[PDB]
Structure formats: structure tokens, C-alpha cells
Write an enzyme that holds these catalytic residues in place. Structure first.
Site, mmCIF file in Angstrom:
data_model
loop_
_atom_site.group_PDB
_atom_site.id
_atom_site.type_symbol
_atom_site.label_atom_id
_atom_site.label_comp_id
_atom_site.label_asym_id
_atom_site.label_seq_id
_atom_site.Cartn_x
_atom_site.Cartn_y
_atom_site.Cartn_z
ATOM 1 N N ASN A 13 0.060 10.888 -1.595
ATOM 2 C CA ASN A 13 1.256 10.325 -0.978
ATOM 3 C C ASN A 13 2.313 10.303 -2.074
ATOM 4 O O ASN A 13 2.214 9.499 -3.003
ATOM 5 C CB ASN A 13 0.917 8.933 -0.429
ATOM 6 N N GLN A 46 8.237 9.628 0.073
ATOM 7 C CA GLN A 46 9.085 8.447 0.010
ATOM 8 C C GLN A 46 9.848 8.395 -1.305
ATOM 9 O O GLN A 46 9.415 8.928 -2.332
ATOM 10 C CB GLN A 46 8.296 7.129 0.150
ATOM 11 N N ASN A 77 1.291 2.379 -0.298
ATOM 12 C CA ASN A 77 0.931 2.892 -1.625
ATOM 13 C C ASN A 77 2.041 2.769 -2.665
ATOM 14 O O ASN A 77 1.759 2.871 -3.864
ATOM 15 C CB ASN A 77 0.582 4.393 -1.561
ATOM 16 N N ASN A 160 1.226 -3.081 10.090
ATOM 17 C CA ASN A 160 1.400 -1.988 11.029
ATOM 18 C C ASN A 160 0.122 -1.886 11.842
ATOM 19 O O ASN A 160 -0.905 -2.457 11.455
ATOM 20 C CB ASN A 160 1.707 -0.676 10.287
ATOM 21 N N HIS A 162 -3.311 -0.395 13.671
ATOM 22 C CA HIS A 162 -4.405 0.529 13.395
ATOM 23 C C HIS A 162 -5.485 0.423 14.460
ATOM 24 O O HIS A 162 -5.787 -0.667 14.951
ATOM 25 C CB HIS A 162 -5.032 0.252 12.021
ATOM 26 N N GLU A 211 -1.691 9.495 11.395
ATOM 27 C CA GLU A 211 -0.670 8.461 11.268
ATOM 28 C C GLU A 211 0.361 8.523 12.387
ATOM 29 O O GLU A 211 0.709 9.595 12.895
ATOM 30 C CB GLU A 211 0.056 8.566 9.932
ATOM 31 N N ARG A 212 0.852 7.341 12.750
ATOM 32 C CA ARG A 212 1.893 7.179 13.755
ATOM 33 C C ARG A 212 3.106 8.050 13.436
ATOM 34 O O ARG A 212 3.632 8.016 12.319
ATOM 35 C CB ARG A 212 2.271 5.695 13.796
ATOM 36 N N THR A 222 -2.915 1.555 4.143
ATOM 37 C CA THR A 222 -3.197 0.493 5.106
ATOM 38 C C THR A 222 -4.264 0.925 6.106
ATOM 39 O O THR A 222 -5.007 0.079 6.635
ATOM 40 C CB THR A 222 -1.923 0.084 5.835
ATOM 41 N N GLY A 223 -4.362 2.228 6.372
ATOM 42 C CA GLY A 223 -5.450 2.716 7.203
ATOM 43 C C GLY A 223 -6.802 2.533 6.543
ATOM 44 O O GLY A 223 -7.788 2.191 7.210
#
Ligand SMILES: [Cl-]
Length: 280
Positions: A13, A46, A77, A160, A162, A211-212, A222-223
Site C-alpha cells: 500500500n 495515498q 496503514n 469501516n 467488513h 476492498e470497497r 483494517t481488513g
């Protein structure tokens, strides 16, 4: 005249990280999109900017933007890259930094070889906290897919949403066909990150995450939190678990009633400098 930056990633990431304490720059939405472009720009998932704190108790402030310039992050992350960066840039000597973020105060703990321990907050499980359409909280739920296929899922909110399903073999799991159906299922009104977990033993799992709004990614942190927490709730996992994501391994620790702790790596890829005018 030139903006200095560092390219970093956490298990793939990848981040552009910019010290805006010793530098000043104007970065609107379009400029961030141009910097994010993989072919015309720096190329990143990001952008993380380090800024002077607004409150006296924080050493730093940061904000994180997606490749389309919106101030959003799905996987959590960036906090690890931040903690490494301010150390590498000699902005501080502390390894327990206090940082002001969009979610409040965070105190990441930088350890050895770029690993960072992060308080990921409390997991939430009630359907209306996900959000997930279900009359009553349950341990597991049957989710109906196309062509009379069903899967069993657990749900977790880590800030978020999951949904976690267990598969016998992460390599053969039909992430491409099942993932989209879960991510946009009518029972997830805000969509959902769909995790596919293979349990190796009570201390090791493998995880693919659809991922969404994105599809399958290398390193949804977070997953990993949600999958590990789910496996612990199902009585399958110990309270400290190595999650092998597509991008590599990290550690999740949790005990019911406490926050989730995530310890994950960081990587310094290169230091860069560019003329921001050509992107504004
Ligand atoms: Cl259903």
C-alpha cells in the site's frame, strides 16, 4: 523551489509522504490527482502530509488523501509510514509520537526495522453498527449470492465495514466472482470490504480482501484486523495472530473488551524532489 518527498509503502500500500513542517505547499484536489497518476506523476495509493499540530499536546498533525484527492483511507496503514517518516526525516527523536489525525489523537509506537504498533480502536459487531441489514445480532450470517450460492459471513466495523468469510484455500478462493457480490450486496447499504480468510492454525491465517470501490488489494490493514478479530470470536484463533495479506505479513492482537492492536512493517522506497508548479 523543489518539494522534497519520500516514497514509502506498507506491504505494498504505497504512499507519497511530504514534510509540510519544514516546507510549505498548496495541494488542491486536482494537484493531488496529478501527483497520484502512475504514468504522469509520482504514482501512489495515498498522499500523507505532515503538518504543524493544531493542539499543544500533539507533536505532529497529518492528513491522508486518496489518489482521487479525497481525504479518505480504507486500510489504516498510513499511520505506520508516518511514524517511520518523522524518525527518518529527523523531525523527532521520539519513538512514541503523539499525532493529531482526522480520527483524533493517535500514539503509534515505532520499533525495530520499521515495524510500528498501532491502536486500531474498538471493533464493533452489531448489524446497525456495520452497517449491515439483519434483524438481530448473531455469531454468523448466511449471505445469499447469485445462482443459489450462499456463504457464511461474520461482520466487523473497524471504522469501516467488513464482512469475513472462511475459505479452505486462499489461492483457489473465488475472490473475483464472490467479492463483487459481497462488496455491493443489498444487505450492506454502504458497501463492504469482503475478506476471504484461510486459517492455517490458531496463530496464522492467510487473507485476500476485495476492498470497497476498489476490488482486490495488496494490504488492507483494517481488513486484517477484522478477519483476525472474527476468527478469535469464532473460537478458531488465539489472541495474537499473524495475518498474511497478498502484500505480506503483519500481526493482530485483540481481547474482547479491549482495542485491536496492529503491528506492521514499513518500507522506505526512495527520496524524491519535484517542481510542484508542473502539477498545479
Ligand atoms: Cl441475503
Amino acid at each position: 523551489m523543489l518539494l522534497e518527498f519520500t516514497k514509502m509503502h506498507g506491504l505494498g500500500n504505497d504512499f507519497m509522504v511530504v514534510d509540510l513542517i519544514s516546507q510549505r505547499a498548496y495541494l488542491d484536489t486536482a494537484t493531488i490527482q496529478r501527483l497520484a497518476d502512475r504514468h504522469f506523476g509520482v504514482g501512489f495509493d495515498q498522499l500523507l502530509i505532515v503538518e504543524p499540530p493544531d493542539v499543544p499536546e500533539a507533536d505532529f498533525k497529518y492528513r491522508i488523501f486518496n489518489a482521487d484527492g479525497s481525504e479518505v483511507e480504507q486500510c489504516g496503514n498510513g499511520v505506520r509510514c508516518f511514524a517511520r517518516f518523522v524518525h527518518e526525516r529527523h523531525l523527532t527523536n521520539k519513538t512514541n509520537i503523539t499525532v493529531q489525525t482526522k480520527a483524533g489523537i493517535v500514539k503509534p509506537e515505532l520499533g525495530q526495522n520499521g515495524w510500528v504498533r498501532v491502536n486500531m480502536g474498538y471493533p464493533k459487531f452489531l448489524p446497525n453498527e456495520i452497517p449491515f441489514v439483519a434483524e438481530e445480532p448473531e455469531a454468523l450470517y448466511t449471505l445469499e449470492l447469485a445462482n443459489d450460492q450462499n456463504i457464511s459471513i461474520d461482520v466487523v466495523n473497524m471504522g469501516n465495514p467488513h464482512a469475513v468469510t472462511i475459505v479452505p484455500d486462499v489461492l483457489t478462493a473465488d475472490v473475483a466472482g464472490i467479492g463483487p457480490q459481497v462488496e455491493s450486496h443489498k444487505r450492506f447499504p454502504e458497501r463492504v470490504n469482503a475478506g476471504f480468510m484461510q486459517v492455517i492454525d490458531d496463530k496464522h491465517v492467510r487473507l485476500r480482501v476485495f476492498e470497497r470501490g476498489v476490488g482486490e488489494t495488496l494490504a488492507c490493514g483494517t481488513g486484517a484486523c477484522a478477519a483476525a478479530v472474527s476468527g478469535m470470536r469464532r473460537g478458531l484463533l488465539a489472541n495474537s495472530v499473524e495475518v498474511e495479506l497478498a502484500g505480506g505479513k503483519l500481526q493482530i492482537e485483540w481481547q474482547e473488551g479491549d482495542v485491536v492492536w496492529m503491528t506492521g512493517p514499513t518500507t522506505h522506497v526512495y527520496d524524491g524532489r519535484l517542481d510542484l508548479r508542473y502539477f498545479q
